[PDB]
Amino acid sequence: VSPPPPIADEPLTVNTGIYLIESYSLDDCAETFKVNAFLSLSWKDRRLAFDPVRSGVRVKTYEPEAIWIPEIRFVNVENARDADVVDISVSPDGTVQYLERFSARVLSPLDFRRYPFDSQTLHIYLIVRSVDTRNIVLAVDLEKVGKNDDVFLTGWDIESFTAVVKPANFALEDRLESKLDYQLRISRQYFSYIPNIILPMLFILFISWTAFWSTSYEANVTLVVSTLIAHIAFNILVETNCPKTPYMTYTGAIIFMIYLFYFVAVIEVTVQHYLKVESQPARAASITRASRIAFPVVFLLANIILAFLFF
Amino acid sequence: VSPPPPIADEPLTVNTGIYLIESYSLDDCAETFKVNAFLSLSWKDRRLAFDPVRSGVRVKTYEPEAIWIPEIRFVNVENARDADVVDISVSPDGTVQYLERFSARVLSPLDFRRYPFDSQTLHIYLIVRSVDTRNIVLAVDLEKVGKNDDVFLTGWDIESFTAVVKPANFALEDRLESKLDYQLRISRQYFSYIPNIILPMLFILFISWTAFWSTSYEANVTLVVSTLIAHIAFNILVETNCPKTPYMTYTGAIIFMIYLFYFVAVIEVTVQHYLKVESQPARAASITRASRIAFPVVFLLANIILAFLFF
Amino acid sequence: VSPPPPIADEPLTVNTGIYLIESYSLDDCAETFKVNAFLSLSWKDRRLAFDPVRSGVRVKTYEPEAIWIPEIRFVNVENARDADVVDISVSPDGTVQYLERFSARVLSPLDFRRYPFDSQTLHIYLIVRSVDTRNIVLAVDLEKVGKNDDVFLTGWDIESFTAVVKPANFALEDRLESKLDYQLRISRQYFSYIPNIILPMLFILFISWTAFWSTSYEANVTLVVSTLIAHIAFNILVETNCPKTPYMTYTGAIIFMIYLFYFVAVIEVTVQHYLKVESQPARAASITRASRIAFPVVFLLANIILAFLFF
Amino acid sequence: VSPPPPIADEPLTVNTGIYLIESYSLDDCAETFKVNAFLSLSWKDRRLAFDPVRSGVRVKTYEPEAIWIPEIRFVNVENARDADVVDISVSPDGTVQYLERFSARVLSPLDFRRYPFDSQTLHIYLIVRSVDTRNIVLAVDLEKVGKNDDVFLTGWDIESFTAVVKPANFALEDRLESKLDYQLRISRQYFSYIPNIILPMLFILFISWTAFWSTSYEANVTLVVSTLIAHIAFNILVETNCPKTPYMTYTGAIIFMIYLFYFVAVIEVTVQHYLKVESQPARAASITRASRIAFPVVFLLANIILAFLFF
Amino acid sequence: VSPPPPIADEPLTVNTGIYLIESYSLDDCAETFKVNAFLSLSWKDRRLAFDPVRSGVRVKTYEPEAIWIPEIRFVNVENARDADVVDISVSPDGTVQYLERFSARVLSPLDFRRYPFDSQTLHIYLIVRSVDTRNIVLAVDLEKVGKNDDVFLTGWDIESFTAVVKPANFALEDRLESKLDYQLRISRQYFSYIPNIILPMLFILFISWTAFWSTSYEANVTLVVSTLIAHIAFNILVETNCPKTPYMTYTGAIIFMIYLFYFVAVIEVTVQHYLKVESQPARAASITRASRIAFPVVFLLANIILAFLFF
Ligand SMILES: [Cl-]
Ligand SMILES: [Cl-]
Ligand SMILES: [Cl-]
Ligand SMILES: [Cl-]
Ligand SMILES: [Cl-]
Ligand code: NA
């Protein structure tokens, strides 16, 4: 119950590996995801070496309390992971094959700038603090890094689960820390977004454009203002945005533009009626006729500009 | 505290059985369900085998710490199950009969394509990882697989609780893993859906169709746009869909179609008024008269097409 | 740490009692309630017999680990109860008097057919599994069954807390199980329902009926459609129903009828205007005049029919 | 260990005290509040008495396991408190001074009859159960009852934290129970309620009253019905009431009255238009002119009656 | 397992330090934030001093139970922190260097008066209670105080993490207590507040001002009342305020003013129509023309006054 002694001056290498069993509860608002996985740890403790002939066993099994085990922690977790040691195996040379099953709620920042056509890299940071007698360094055993084929997150395509093999070794509170980056790459399943969110939102906006084929101010006021209520109501219904994001998203810009279009359509309807009442029906009719083309064209153009800027 | 030795080279068979005591908290949005059940385990350990004549006991009772017990885990659980060992009995031949009561929040994907006329198969996957000295294989004791008659899930008919007797044996992290599939078959109780969701949603759409028996543009605009607000408001009220499903559901298609119908009804109302104002009342009146039949017929037909496509 | 031996071949009787300290968090949607209570247990274990003279003490106190205690579990709980052993007293004959304070989230189905004039029977099922050496049977000590006078559930009248003295003894997984039914009878406090939910919902419906004293189609369309929006909005506000109940409730039928009435009132308004525009003001005026009586009468009648059918 | 022996036949007095460190999470809907505090306990155990000269110490420190400690529980808690023993000190005469830090979610009924001008008394009930050897009685050490100056509940003024010094001693399940009542007196901070809820609600109602300076039935219908929608929408926004309170509150009565006023204003608007259309403009104009004074006067009067009845 | 003895009569100095690893879940409504950090502790215990020559080691490692460790608690936490002792190192002179990793939900009051242009100071209060044999005093080791560069709170800029080096020593329950103040300074980054909440809210208000270029009372009533509904609906959608803050915020005043402006615009529309109907079109037209300038000017001025008063 002391770290294994060095042969020369070299640090202790703890070979790690995470195998995803379950991925669930991805909360876009909280920027958190719950994970259920295997954590494999491999290191050499020569004090544990044995002759397989004199022992009669090819492998030795130990209880966690019986031998020295490195304190591996996760950096970006809410609380410490719930762990259950599955197996501890010692081969004749003193190599330890530690395996545990754990569950953890991981905190990983999400970039919503390209939502709902966004891809995310979820992070799981492994860490080890170096001790008094010797330095502890983390390594990746890519044979031990993987994910179950049945792993799923609803509304996401899981591209890959990999690790950045080079650890981040740095000093913290006068000791070395070896940090590893495990990455879960996911891309959003944006199909139902068109018929469920985009298309009905566009229909509501198009209804407000019918005011360009009407001279009735009362009917026009009802058209633009009632559709604005319908738009807001629809947004409450589809709740596309989490509590307001601090930065400007792609969908966020489109939505802002839709509010601007409802305001401009009101200005037009107001201008039309005023000119019509102030004995100038030639201008009122020419503006309304221009708007019939101006509104869809300016919308389609601004959308192309936005799609270009974000992608 | 080592696995039982093989008589030849055969793997150890752990006979399993799950008996549902309680089923509750089925969450459609989270795709999870909470279960409270018995887990029975049976395996042969000849080190525990005894002669009854020289021992004088029917069965020997042991504490979990006293003997070797296989590490059975669940694949699709949020956290490790809360277990309470009920009984451990050993018969003269060394057959260990283990029983525990557990509670677990199970993650099982749900198919909403046919909602609210859907049926689901809830899964509970048992798993065992083989050890150094011998391979462990799972089996189903059908006598010990069942459910309490009082087991219920509000709004669901619990059809059956069975297990796929053939385990899924595969290699994972250089060891054999034996997986079992326990299935809970449930079918939704869709009756109150007609009077609570469908019928009021159809009434709001039918109100919009009264615009086909009116020439008043102001009254027509109020009819189609105000019913669209009422439709959206109603959807907020009945909250029939969870946060957006990535795929197209049956109810999802009907709802999309209802939004399309509100848009088409606006187009008609717009066309009719324009023709009337542009001194063409013959064309306007003929369109409105056609719409009176076209709208219910196209709706009833498209619904038949959708119901056919999904079922 | 083995069950007490039988004097003859008789089963071991465990006398139970539950005394409610606090009842809280009744969740109508989840069909669950949280309870805080005393669980008293009593049985004879003659191995614990002592002479009060040689011991000095008239009663002996033990730690739970020191003696055999029956494994009592609750059938309908989310997880196993949080228990705190208050006292364990052994009298010279070997009679054990066990007392624990526990908290548990109990799952009990609720019948909303007569809401908000409903009464419910909340269940707490005690259970004991029989052992190898002897059968265990549960019994009710009525002196030990009760509830604190201050026990409350907001919006409910707590009628009684009793137990069905005859246990339900049955075989499960080749062993006897003795089950007890503890019942908490509650009846809803429906007073504020009239001024808070019923009356404002009726006012909105009555506003729609003012269209029967108007010939203005535009004002009538605004009356019936805007009140329909107000009705839906009001329902969102008072959120009277949990996520859709699988069965048809009393309030559910009234609400369905209110939607039907808004649809019929639209049909009338549509018919009246069509007859007026189609040069038939005699027929239009006679329908509108009939509706003035027909609508309140048919409503009042259908409500009497519904109240009769449900109660 | 067993309870300290009586010198005569007197019960054991356990002097208590609670010092609030943190008060947080006051939930009006659940009628629950979370508390973080010190629990001090003092009693005399002559078996623990010592000579400070022969011992060399003026005070003795013990571990909880080393000595007898009374089992103090809280009556109105969700689950048993999370406790951490801070200190146990024994003086030469055998006086035990126990101190622990605990956190607990307390269940305390709230009276909303005078909301938002309400004051509440939050309760924390301490309890001790007597043993066969001797009766245990609770007492209040007022020097030990207090609260941190920084203790706060947002939107509340914390008046005082005191205890009812006389315990409630009663028999329960054949043993004496001594109960103490700790009271946290709080009064609501109702200032932002005027500009945030009342004034905008009143504005909407006043907007409906402008229909008394208009003869346009279409404009009047839009005024009263659209403001009713705005009123309902506003109440959804400010969510002033928890899930329906079983009793009639002050705000509840005002809100009911506001719905009644919207109904009466519709009746007036209906009556005025009917009289106008039925060639009686003298009667219509006289009603509308009366309403201009009748509506604000009846409102202001009924509000005075309500304020009087509730306060 | 007794505190270290004083060389003279001096109190024991416990040098503290907190290093933020993760900061997450800042809840504005609850006034809480979850933190994951290192807690370093250092004090002198001469009973632990050793000769590095006779021992062979330069540093000694101990288990928490092997030595005396001061009981450090946090004042403003929901429950006691989840702690995991990382390392305990003793140097030859008896200096103990303790390190633990903890997670805690911290309660810290938030000032929303300047939202969303507000800055907050989050507090973490360390505390130690003095013992019988000697007084314990806290100190700050600034070398051990810091935060990870990757530490983030979405929508916030983390300015600094520091500690007030002078402890607050006071008396509590007859013992001296030493308290430390750790401060996390954060400033709200809400780049998107203007486009996401302000501008759509101003557009709705501006739409209501188009009633100043219209004489149609029916169109004006629809303009001001429908925009009021749109405003309320928008506020339900953007949910900018937590459950009503007891004090008046900056955004709170702006929103109150917006409701006042909707009321004044209704008064104008009412006055204008009354004057028109009461054969005074000169006075009506002059008011409406004044309002065109009066409304934006009074709005822009009052906003400058508010921005001045709050900042
Ligand atoms: Cl961890
Ligand atoms: Cl498990
Ligand atoms: Cl239980
Ligand atoms: Cl407690
Ligand atoms: Cl703490
Ligand atoms: Na309208």
From Swiss-Prot, chains A, B, C, D, E:
Homopentamer. GO terms for molecular function: extracellular ligand-gated monoatomic ion channel activity; identical protein binding; potassium channel activity; sodium channel activity; transmembrane signaling receptor activity. SUPFAM superfamilies: Neurotransmitter-gated ion-channel transmembrane pore, Nicotinic receptor ligand binding domain-like. One of its GO terms (cellular component) is plasma membrane. Changing residue 218 to A: Decreases cation selectivity. Decreases the binding affinity of TEA and TBA. Nearly abolishes block by Cd(2+). It comes from Gloeobacter violaceus (strain ATCC 29082 / PCC 7421). The lineage of its organism: Bacteria, Bacillati, Cyanobacteriota, Cyanophyceae, Gloeobacterales. This is Proton-gated ion channel. Changing residue 238 to M: Displays an increased sensitivity to propofol but not to desflurane. The keyword Lipid biosynthesis does not apply. Changing residue 251 to A: Marked gain of function, with a ten-fold shift of the proton dose-response curve towards lower concentrations. Also shows slower apparent rate constants for activation and deactivation. The chain crosses the membrane at residues 190-212, 216-240, 249-277, 281-311. It comes from the Bacteria. Consists of an N-terminal ligand-binding domain that encloses a wide aqueous vestibule and a transmembrane domain that forms a narrow channel. It is a multi-pass membrane protein. Residues 213-215, 278-280 are cytoplasmic. The homologous nature of GLIC to eukaryotic nicotinic acetylcholine receptors and other eukaryotic pentameric ligand-gated ion channels, and its sensitivity to general anesthetics, define GLIC as a structural and functional model of signal transduction in the nervous system, also relevant for exploring the molecular basis of anesthetic action. Residues 1-189, 241-248 are periplasmic. It is found in: Cell inner membrane. Cationic channel with similar permeabilities for Na(+) and K(+), that is activated by an increase of the proton concentration on the extracellular side. Displays no permeability for chloride ions. Shows slow kinetics of activation, no desensitization and a single channel conductance of 8 pS. Might contribute to adaptation to external pH change. Keywords: Cell inner membrane, Cell membrane, Ion channel, Ion transport, Ligand-gated ion channel, Membrane, Potassium, Potassium channel, Potassium transport, Receptor, Signal, Sodium, Sodium channel, Sodium transport, Transmembrane, Transmembrane helix, Transport.
